[PDB]
Amino acid sequence: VSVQQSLAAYNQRKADLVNRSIAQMREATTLANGVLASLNLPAAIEDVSGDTVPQSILTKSRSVIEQGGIQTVDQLIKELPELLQRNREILDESLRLLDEEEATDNDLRAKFKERWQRTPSNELYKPLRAEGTNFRTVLDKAVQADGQVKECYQSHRDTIVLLCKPEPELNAAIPSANPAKTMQGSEVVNVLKSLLSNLDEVKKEREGLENDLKSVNFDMTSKFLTALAQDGVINEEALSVTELDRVYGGLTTKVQESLKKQEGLLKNIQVSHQEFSKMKQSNNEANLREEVLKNLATAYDNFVELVANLKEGTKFYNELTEILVRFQNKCSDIVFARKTER
Template identity: 85%
Template sequence: GGIQTVDQLIKDLPELLQRNKEILDESLRLLDEEESTDNDLRTKFKERWQRTPSNELYKPLRTEGANYHNILNKAMQADGQVKERYQTHRDTIALLCKPEAELNAAIPSANPAKTLQGSEVVNVLRTLLANLDEVKKEREQLENDLKSVNFDMTSKFLTALAQDGAINEEAISVTELDRIYGSYTQKVQDSLKKQEELLKAIQNAHQDFSKMKQSNNESNLREEVLKNLAVANDNFVELVANLKEGTKFYNELTEILLKFQNKCSDIVFARKTERDELLKDLQQSIAREPSAPSIPLPTYQTTPAAGTKPAASPTPTPAPRTMVGTKPQPPARPPPPVISAASSSSSALAPSGTAAAPAAAPAPTPGASAPAAGAAPSQAQGPPYPTYPGYPGYCQMPMPMGYNPYMYGQYNLPYAPSPVYQNPGQPPYPPPQQPGYPFPQQPYYHQQ
């Protein structure tokens, strides 16, 4: 591919780097947005926002993201070094990638008239180099011979043990090694001596050859160009390897960052679902709370005034029907009265021999307060006694009314029956009927 391959690889690196940076930035942005939302809600609801803070939950992910960020920074530095080296040797690499004809034209050629091909120094140097090649071949053959030697000291040691009853290991080993490897030792020493002599001769011949080359400027320029081309070739191979490795690195890092992004997306989605459920619970809890605190009652409604009795209980307590020996007895009953037809028909509705019980007091309205302004209970009723007309000369006096706080300040309640004063010898008036009772109203005797 030549220079075009290197240019394309260098052009692809920034795109791969930018893609990885965008994936990493998007992953961290998801975490930042969710953490910001969590902090805002925690500030808003304070102690009601009972869940793990996002900044603590995301510590492993942020550490992993910081590691990826450092990797990308190091990759950017490596890319910069590769680009700098490429720019340094780009011209020579471009020359090296040209066709062979253009390459030969760009390289200075030595003048045949001035070449050293037929000089004595060159011939001597070539002969010495050929002798050096022969030494190398002898070395290889000697090495193979040494490796093929069968060296076994077991039989020697056993024979010595059987003859003498003891083993002189050092003496036997030295003798046997000299017998087997003595000839090879001599050959190695001769090869080393020959090598040293050849190296000295080659150095001297090369010095003479270098002096002759320095006198030819065109040859020096050619050598410089060839040296630069060799360096350019080495850099080209290394640059292509580095760029391919960088491309592979960025592609593998992209897969890793995509997994990291999926991990961040999953945990952010889970946190969002948890946040929505918690918000729903908080909204329901707030909706069930009272909108305002209960207003205390005024002092004049809760504290009884001076000279007044405290409010009675909303549930009336019926007065005792009979107090033996403690209260004065009521006056004797008058004789039975003459019951009218209307009274007889209404009285016939009740079963004979059974006294009808009065209706129960009305139940208090739910939510109503229990101060003295509550509904007035019905007065306790005794058994239905018949009303008798008074004797001549006797005037039925009204019974004293006790203090009943429920009888004041009420609306839509029946008034208490007024006491009836009868003249002597006059039949009594029928008592008024109370609503809801199927019996005629009987007089109430207040118990003292």
């Protein structure tokens, strides 16, 4: 037993406590924000007009206008059969070269019998014909992909055209009426703002439950020595449990209560959210405004998916240009060399 042998013993445990609470504090904070963004919150009790057009929609509309519009798309669709057929004619001409030598060689071997000491004009052209069959299989998939995407385009063609044109003409399309009559006058809006403001108070209360926990410091060396003197040996584990639980009992309770309160609040708020967005139909005209925006989401995002397949293509044909030339000439080099000997 030396001069000092139980000083750092407590501080290590002090670290293994405060940090534990911080983890079970900040993690809960982020969890709340994630749910709000998923269910369109807290930005769902501010905008009210009906007549004017949305802001997010207005931004997406000008994005399509900025990148041309219906004209940029139509010119890409119309030129697809042009470029697709252009490659097809080169394909048939390349394969004709193989049939060319074979047509002459087959007739030559029949009449002139002295041509059986060399590789026939078939086995040499056999690996090349194997590549040829592969190409048409792609064309079937290329056309099939070309067909289904064109079908998806025409079904939502009117919606694409809708994206262009001036804004006032577009505004007339939007259902000019009150979004929901049961929002103004019913007790449904009132049982919502109060719920959020009560939940918001949790965030502000948590501000106090951070700096306080961080600045925890209380010297208590006298008690450890009391145990050393009275008992004889310092029991670090057993004595700490009885001591720390009593002094930091309410600190944990209020934290657990706040989490339990948040757990309790969120459970009732989620049901209120169901009650909040229940009246989609509402009275007579309300769901229609929602259905309008529903098609646009399936229009703007669909716009990207449709363009993406066009992006897969186009460049697809251009890189084929470098391939088909070396491919076509490769066959000619074999045929010409075969013709040279005789």
